[model samples]
Target: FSRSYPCDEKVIAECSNRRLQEVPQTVGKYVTELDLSDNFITHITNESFQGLTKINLNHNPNGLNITDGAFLNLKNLRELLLEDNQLPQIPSGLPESLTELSLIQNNIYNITKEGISRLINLKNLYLAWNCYFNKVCEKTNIEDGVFETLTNLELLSLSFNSLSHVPPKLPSSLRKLFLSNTQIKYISEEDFKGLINLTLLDLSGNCPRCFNAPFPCVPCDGGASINIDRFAFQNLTQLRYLNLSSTSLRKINAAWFKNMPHLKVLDLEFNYLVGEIASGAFLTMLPRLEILDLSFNYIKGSYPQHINISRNFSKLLSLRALHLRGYVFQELREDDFQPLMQLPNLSTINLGINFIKQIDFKLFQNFSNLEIIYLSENRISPLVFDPHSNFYHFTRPLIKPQCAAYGKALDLSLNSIFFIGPNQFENLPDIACLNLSANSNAQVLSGTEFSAIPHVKYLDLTNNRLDFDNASALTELSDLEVLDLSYNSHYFRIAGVTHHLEFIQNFTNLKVLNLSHNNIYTLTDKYNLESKSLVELVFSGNRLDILWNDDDNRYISIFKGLKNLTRLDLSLNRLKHIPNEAFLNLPASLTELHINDNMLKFFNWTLLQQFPRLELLDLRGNKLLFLTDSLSDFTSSLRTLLLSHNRISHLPSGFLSEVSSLKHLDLSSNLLKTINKSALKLSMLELHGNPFECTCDIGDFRRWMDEHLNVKIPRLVDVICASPGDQRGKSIVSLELTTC
Candidate 1:
């Protein structure tokens, strides 16, 4: 029996997932809303809910069938959701008062005119993904005049269908139309003539071309590009957003954007749009445009050497964000974006992943309102800043650097900066976020390199080759909050090993620090690295395990000063065991610990008593054969336990019995053949990639999963059996063990 919800004594039925075979008669005659979704209902009889105003019948897995005149009596119905039902066509005899109709994920291949002509009051219609699947999506057809009578329809979606062309006879009152991921390759000029009220249109991924990419991509038939009539969108005057991304468009024409003055966002990313962008055709057309994305359109030899937006860019006064990522341009001239500097509202610009070697620093001096500028993944060398290189051509720099005053964040990462002089950042100031990580041949950094930029809060110098002597150079950054110096000596270890860490005590405001993968062998005498404001530290991928064999407590003084340290990541260190002295100085405020990818065969579970508030522990990628049965009382507050990719063959029932607050556990990719059941109070569980035998031994687990359906097992279908030849590759949850 489905429960009746009493909202101030008003009648509302909640009949979802009750295995309802039929509509119940217990609902009152005055019920206005009814939910019968996720049920086994097969057919809808007549006069089921006479006075309902809204009804949901979603995911009727037994294949719902709406009999004729089933909803004839629902005169006051305004919304009906029938999604994911095996419907061959639109149900006949729906109430004419319905304003919303959803038939998404149905089996309807053809939309006959007579089937949908009666829903005259429908304001929103969803008919996406309506095709049968054999080997590919079967082509769906929409007959002419099927939507002619829906004059009040404002939104219509027909995505993921196999229609070769746009359907004709759409209502003129429609405001949003989505025909994305269809087979339509071309659009005629007369297609959208009367749709002047349309405000949003998406036609993305219709004919994608990616010449044998790593992912699945479809080239246009006969290797031809998408062609559009010059005046195709002339009548869409009220359009605000138009998306044509990944449509294999090769050229840009200004005629398509002539009459659309109200357009605000134009997305033309992932196409073959090249050289045409340099012709400045988009300058005068989109006067009110605020965002334009022309990213990932690179072709080898056809791209222009410099973006020639020097003409008429001043007309786009409302432009705020411009994305030109992966354009593969060679250089940026001084006057290339000078015209756009006149726009006072332009804030963000992306020029990443282009092989730009040279840059004009004066080109960004006048952007008064710019917030962030991205010049990442380029080949600009730090030698440009050296006086010996003599690349300084700035005659009249701005009074205040634009990137420092207003543009708080700048990404100059992934460059080829070999050396940094003493006055590296002396000219820049007031910048809050700066990323200079992943540089090539970064050999030396003097102590006076960062004498300026005192206001920078976040600095990322990861994946470089700064010597340990240079660590003392950063002691001048008093206002620095987050510093990432990980992977500095891992790849370039041949240069030298960084053995010392020059003072972190001067960094009174530092919060998060990452020094992983630095090949640090041991701490020096009286290292005295202390930080009260630091919360997290990542010291993984180093030889911290080398301190295990030392008899004297040399490492005890290393971390005794970090009073506020909470999270520690010590993964990827080849530690076979943990020395008792190593934990003598670890802070007690830690709530999370990661010792994954280690060589430990036995974990000392009792050692976790130091941090009583620990909430998460990760032991993945280890060689542990078993765990300690008594974990003591320290794990009472733990919430997550990750044990994936280990060599554990069995888990004792008492191992996690004390963790009452544990909510998430992972046992995936282990050598477990069978695991005994316990009262593991968890909301999420991962047991996949285990060699489970589909025999009587695992029948209890399958039953436990069936009983505790609330525990979310991610990728459960991939949790298949790997033994007993008959059920070699079958899901354990679906295995039948009748003999057990």
Candidate 2:
């Protein structure tokens, strides 16, 4: 029996014959565990498992034909794992000594109360992922103590099955229960009286059908209409985690959680609660609640004024994280957050994607301990801070005490902030990470506009209307680490007064600079800016046709001053050739270089070989004909090589064989007529977008493409012949496999 066999015992056997009928009777006596997983042995008589302690008979090609008294002989069985076997019905007469059992991923249809009552000592049971076919009978006459026999059971998982109605009466000692992805209906008040000690309950993905009968309600016009009772969640007092997401709930009243005082985390996201949260809905009734997610609902509101916080929220002193974004609620006023100030321990509050126009300084005076505030994707306009507007007086002098101690992070990005007036942040002393990107009208800030927030760091102003004159406003941010001014009009030079060049030389602490997507064709020599601490510089999507010469270097000495530059991006530029010493005096920390989408016809191996730490080189979308030099010497650390969209007809025989660290190679969109299978040295090779001969020579390439289906290949229309047969103007689809 299982009790006699100790825990450290192991047994192994193989059964192949289908007509063997019954397994060896003495096979269960010697071994503590038996695995008859794959066999045709379906029926089990009384004396089959006379001495077995644990058995696994899963994955049998033929369906398991278990009889009523099949498990009666297994008197000492403690654990059994029978999954993936094709069984029509629940196995009958399980041993009383069995403590754990699993019949998951099978075809179990029905289970009667009489069969479940036999397992007296069962503590764990798993019957999930089954395809049940029978309709669950109504529990009209079922007694209250039906499942009292399973008192010792601690965990039960019956998820992903075809259970239509709610199950009646469960064990009292059950700590965890999973009933997700079923067809359970309404739960009455009498159904949950015995589960007093239950800790976790997951009833998600179950479409409940309540209120089939209609009740008459007086209409506004004078007539009465019948309204059915939708679904409702009843009495669950001791539950700590409850998930009722995507349940088609139109409105949630305050009385839903009236009896659940110990509930801590509740997820009501992805529901149909449209714009109407009843008064006192989330009141102080749930004193122990901490996390509440209400995302992806239809709670309509234009600004902060639409969805007012419940007054009872002031009593939930233990609440910490509250998510009320991405819903129909748009606007947020000062009163919407007044109740949150009552919770002294609150930390994170997400208000992203709302219609909050202005942030009055007085609104933040209460949240003394607030840490992170998300206000992105809103109509927050910085131009509202202009002194002429009446709202300016309400937000001009931001009180320092409100945001000084906790160092709150205010995210006002993705808004309409056109210009920053002088002394905008005069009171925010401990602010950090101010993101104002994606604002079309935002320009460079004035020099004294941000002099107040001395501790402010990590300013993001990418995708704006920043010009060269805006450099004067950037000098005040001495503590800035990451400054993104990419995707802006950076070539608009100020006429007559050339003093703007000197303004950029003052910011000596800048580390990361992104000036991509601009119109600056050349860097003049008059600007004597030297970025000694700069590390990463991105100049992609620019009009730089030539590198600075001796006369130009005088005005553009800033590049030579960057002694710590590492990561550089010069892609999508107008450069035709690499100037001598163009990247001279480079830092030893240079690791990644991006020079794609240029006019270079040949690969300049020497330009990148000078850097000892260069590891990744992206040279796609160029006019390179071929690689005549041996690039393996300079590519010792190169791990990724991208050479797509070029005019090369063929690759070097051992072009990448010597590069030890080369792991990824992409040669798509080229004029390659054929490829040698032995030439591929890396683990991944992308050779699509080339005109290839479809003869027997290309059988190797076709097989390789079929093997690696995950790699992207250019369309047949874009790939055609460039040689021999003059199929240059034809698509790859027109060429047959025998054509060369």
Candidate 2: tens digits of C-alpha lDDT, residues 1-740:
22111111235433332223455553434666776665556666675765457777766645766778678677788888777676655677777888888887676666556666778788888777674332442212223444568888877777667665546768888876776555554555555567777777766545421221011111112211111122133545678877665454555555667777888877665554434333455555678878766655543332334665666667777777676655545455668678888788776676666566655545655685666666667776653211112210112312123332335666667876667645345445266666667777445556766676665556767777754565566677777766777777533555522324445456667777777776555444444345667788887876545334335444233356666777888788766655545554445567787879988675567666677788777888889887634677665777787888888877766675567677787888888888767644355666656877755566565565556544334333344555556656554444555543
Best by lDDT: 1
State candidate 1's TM-score.
0.71
- Steric overlap count per candidate: 0, 15
Least accurate 10 contiguous residues by lDDT in model 2: 385-394
Q: Tens digit of lDDT per residue, candidate 1, span 191-266?
A: 7888989999888767765651322556678756667788899899899988887778777778888888988988
Query: Which lDDT values do the candidates have, in the order given?
Result: 0.74, 0.61
